[PDB]
Request: fold
Amino acid sequence: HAESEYGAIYSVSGPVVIAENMIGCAMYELVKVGHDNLVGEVIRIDGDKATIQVYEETAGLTVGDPVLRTGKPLSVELGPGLMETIYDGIQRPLKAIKEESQSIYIPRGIDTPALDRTIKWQFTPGKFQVGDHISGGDIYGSVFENSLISSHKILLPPRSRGTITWIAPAGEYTLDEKILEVEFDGKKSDFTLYHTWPVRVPRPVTEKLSADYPLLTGQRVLDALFPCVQGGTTCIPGAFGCGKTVISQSLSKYSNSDAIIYVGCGERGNEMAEVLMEFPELYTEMSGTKEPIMKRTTLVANTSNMPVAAREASIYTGITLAEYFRDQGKNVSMIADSSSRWAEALREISGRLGEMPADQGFPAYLGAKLASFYERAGKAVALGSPDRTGSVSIVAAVSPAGGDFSDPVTTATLGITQVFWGLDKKLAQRKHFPSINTSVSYSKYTNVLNKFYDSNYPEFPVLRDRMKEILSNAEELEQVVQLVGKSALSDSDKITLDVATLIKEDFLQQNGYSTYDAFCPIWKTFDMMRAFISYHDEAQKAVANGANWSKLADSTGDVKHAVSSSKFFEPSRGEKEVHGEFEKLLSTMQERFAESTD
Amino acid sequence: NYNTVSGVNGPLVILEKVKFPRYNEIVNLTLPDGTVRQGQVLEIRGDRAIVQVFEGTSGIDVKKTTVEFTGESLRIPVSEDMLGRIFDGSGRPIDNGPKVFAEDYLDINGSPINPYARIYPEEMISTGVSAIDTMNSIARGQKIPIFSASGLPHNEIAAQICRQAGLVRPTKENFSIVFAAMGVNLETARFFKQDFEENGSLERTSLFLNLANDPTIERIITPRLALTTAEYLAYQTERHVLTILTDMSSYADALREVSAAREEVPGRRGYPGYMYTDLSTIYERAGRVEGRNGSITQIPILTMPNDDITHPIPDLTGYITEGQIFVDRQLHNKGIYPPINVLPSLSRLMKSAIGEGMTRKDHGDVSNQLYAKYAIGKDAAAMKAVVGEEALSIEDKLSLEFLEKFEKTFITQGAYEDRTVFESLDQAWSLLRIYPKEMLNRISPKILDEFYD
Amino acid sequence: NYNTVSGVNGPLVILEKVKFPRYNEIVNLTLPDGTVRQGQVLEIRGDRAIVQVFEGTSGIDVKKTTVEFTGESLRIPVSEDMLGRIFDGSGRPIDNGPKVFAEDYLDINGSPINPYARIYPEEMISTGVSAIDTMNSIARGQKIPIFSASGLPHNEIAAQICRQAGENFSIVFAAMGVNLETARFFKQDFEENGSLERTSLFLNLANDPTIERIITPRLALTTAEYLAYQTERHVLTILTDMSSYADALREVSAAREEVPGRRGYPGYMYTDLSTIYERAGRVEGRNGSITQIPILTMPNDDITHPIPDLTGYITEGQIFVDRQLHNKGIYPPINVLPSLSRLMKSAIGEGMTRKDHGDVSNQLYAKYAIGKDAAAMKAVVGEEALSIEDKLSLEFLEKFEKTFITQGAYEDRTVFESLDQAWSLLRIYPKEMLNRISPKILDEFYD
Amino acid sequence: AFIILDEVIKVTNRRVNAIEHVIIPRTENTIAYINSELDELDREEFYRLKKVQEKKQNETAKLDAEMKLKRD
Reply:
């Protein structure tokens, strides 16, 4: 605003831009550089020449192009209207930018508003009285952004506390219009429905709370083996094109949380495009009738074809957005595609800066950002009079080279994570269903998850430990069979191998393209594991009666085909038919016992 | 134009007495011997500037050299007259034709497609291959690579793809392609030339050829020229645009060469640290544009070092492009027709072209089931090779014969023989018919009752 | 003091035209955002100075920041009123209490122990676990290193160890970039025990800066030193998530552009590691005993990393946790192969524990080794368990693994109970099968 | 004794089956992957050392520039 604090461009090589004659610019502060007035973030300072990191394309710029420092850190707009809106690395709307530039390409030095100032919404003062003392975090109003989620909270700006002075009446308004005025010791301050929050510091809450509420995965392996609760940190490391993007889409789809913040980093454009095409076609069938997946989520795009710093910037913006969603008193989640692109971006950054590399080209501050991003999310009571309990889950994809755990990504991820879900390329290469290693994937949140699953009086821990033991014993049995042969084992080990195969084909493997196996309910998987355990106990008891495993498997073909047919099933109705089918299975076992004698 | 030059070290250049230089700017270097070499600007600091020589700093005087700086960024003379005429890696005519009149002057760097402007992968195509149809589907406008080994029939199989492409695709207006080589062999150049001539598409296609005899800079710049050309064809020309790029291995090693020549801090396996993004430059350019006719379908070809699929080249290839079609040395020495590895090979979108309304509802499930029988056949092959022929189960021998038959019949069709997708589905239903009724657990009841004669 | 600076590289700051600068000194800086923070001067050269920020250099203007240098090194306010309360990474109270009255003020770096004034502890402190107090003898005043892996419940085992342990023994904790969940669980355990009132720590979390946590560990170390040299009581020092401390020290050395070693560690680190192990040891004439028992995570579950290598080479003995036994489902996974205690020498025999102690320990090591080789043989060869010796070795190994190895976290057993349980467990093997057992040890328990 | 001699012979053959394409290949892959990881780690360390030596050379060149400046 005609302040004209400006340094001059000195050295320019690739994405890094060093600008001198500016001592006014701070560290991690926003600055408009070049002749195109491109947004950027200054990193270091040496003498009279401060090193600035550009988050955009530096191609075409020339020496002598002025750089204006704002002096303030990175910030994003928080409030209603950002939902179901695709923001770029500059946090500008993609549709609006493409329409304004009238080109499918990406320009350079472009400036556009986050939300729409011409956008109107119906905002109503939520039970708050004028003159009542208020502070930061309190809801000053409520607006309906979508047809499902209603009353998006307008939060009082940070570092503000006092008494309500002039709070305007409810009605239709925009994001640029002040809906309130608050009097304090700092005299007068204008308050709007939209509040600006720094991207460097996540939106604060009241106090950290223990998360005992399990978040529904929808998948058997994600809910049972390596569990992830609401606010829990679950890693999803995978190989290149191992279905990592697919697992991310499945996770953001079948999620039982309220909102979703998905920030793509260095991912393919066809994935986000397919996401944009299939978002609106899919609609929720739960409460809030007529509501799609697009309106219940927000998408941030940092392309692989985009700038390198755009990934870390969109990641931080997505973190601030998820923190604002967690401060909104709702359970949300962050879906990150290929965090390894941001890590490698950090590697090229520290590398171009002249700093010394250690492992995998990255700097030594990687662990700080990883641990900060992991401990940032969680379940905690938010600020404000509302006193709501918020939740934020962190889901980050790591793409190590060749799927090796020796990669810096895998280690740094596994270090700060309380839960990790691993992806295998063995069953993925065979075009088999979702691949997860039973000898690798584990969760430290599994205990409280067992305590939470006991609320439904399901047995998570028992079935999981029994199946894991059966899996390990069958794996050892596989090592022995591969060692000597299949004729060197006993009836019980063979039963363990057959049960392993049954658990492999009929349980862990579920077709996502199917009209049935695409989504598995809690009761469905619980009943399946229970019926499996019942058939296993019945077979183990029958083998102890002096019957061979093969002879037992001779008349058990019906129960086998029935156990393999539990994947299709039907809607919520007919669970009784399944449990009853299990009863018919035990009865069938009794009939077989009668048949044996004789 | 500044005639002042300061230092020279290795394959690079440094000049002084200049200001306001542009990043990756086109610069003309006139040497002391009268040699005119094209070059690009590296960095600019104060009154000093640093640039990289494409033709090399070999045989160049320090104070006797003159340089004319355009100041504009990387610029190419794109036109509509490129079809039927051949161009080199340096842009100069290798077809011994006259001067090509440029319709538009555009940056060869290429522009990233906006996400909202990005249209989802759709339709389908017939590559003439059962594996390019059944196992892993190929969408029109999508991007899929080909991973081969040194000495293997990469050029010949790719030739089969480019030759059978426009012929078979109509069965799902002839298809127009683009041939691109970066630091490639003379033998492979002759093979590709005879292939493009035999296809008769040489008139309807353009060729950018950078020989191995040529510099590395030209090889790295060939991909950019092909990117701008294919972009101009898939947008401005509004026609179906196939993108065929070869010798990615040479461009990679050359990239490592340029990265080391500047003594820059290298990443894993000695390559560049920006390699993900460097490959993503031309990799994410593929896709469809909403409202704009035509599309750019990327069909790249790379060679894994020492036939290692676990190599950083292939790993980065999978990390950049989405999905790949593998060529294994295991099946190449078996003597059967072109060696596609079922495990490693996968498609970007195999769910987009399947189902009713596209082709048939018998496609996808049969793909999953056939892949299952093949994998089970491989594991059973290992188990049979371990313990013995009498020590394996019934499913082991059945899947073994099924995989052997799938390899001898389904996998083996021909290079100049383009098998229609329908023939692929029929031969696949007949290959699956070899297996028992309880054999396929990935197949539905209806398809099982329908496929069996 | 200087409000004028030259340049800023990362968290490290460098100013010019500075006078009376002190290397490794406490400095108070007020930034442009109105925020005030503490930092430490890394170096001073000529008319120029180099100081570092512990809380980070982010969000600060070079013109609007003012650095007030005390001219002297860092001095912490050690007090006896810190019992039961809590402090932050910078020392500020996180217990929502006020600032306590300081008894004394001294350096957080601690003090070097005299060569003639040191005392070698033979003291025997019961660990409470059957696989702990027996295998690697727990001794107050000794130093036992702890290396863990990612996703390993080292915090739970350490908490169960401090809880089943307890003149009582005071515990001082030092957190370097400790996780939020880790702090929550540690708080839950410390509160569940009821010994939280007798304990104190300086908390620097993951959400908080981990770079200021390096001084927090030093602060807790000066607290343990002041506890040993004044209060005269049994003291145990602990550094949590020391892996983050090594990564941070490595970041500080990397920012210095000095000669880097393996995993980015500093060149003079040879002395630096000692500072982590200098938090232990007793003195002549002091009834109290201070023993540091740090815990860190070896990178990629590999002890071959510089961290576990230095931690093992410096300190005497190390407590290892196997990933396999933790994935098995059994209780605490101490690997008898890698785990050892140099303090298990003077703490064994009659007068300390029992005359059957050392013998049963060596016999346990031999049985575990023979069982391991028998496991390798059982894996390579058939299920016939390789003749006789390997069969009894593997059976006894598995039996000792399902019983002796897992004593439970919530269960507190004496050394005698573990000795009797081992006496019942060694009955499977013959009396002549023990080559580590003497004539007296063979005639020891015939009951 | 002949019958058992057959059975045991089969056992030996089984070992030959395991020592052929199983144990040998596993050891080969383990040795190769370990060789690649170790050589790569040594390459990274050598890169750090090369950067350190380059840093010393540049600092020395700055010393030389300072000496020339003092001379001037």
Summary: Residues 409 and 442 of chain B are 22 Å apart (CA to CA). The radius of gyration of chain B is 25 Å. The longest strand of chain B covers residues 36-45.
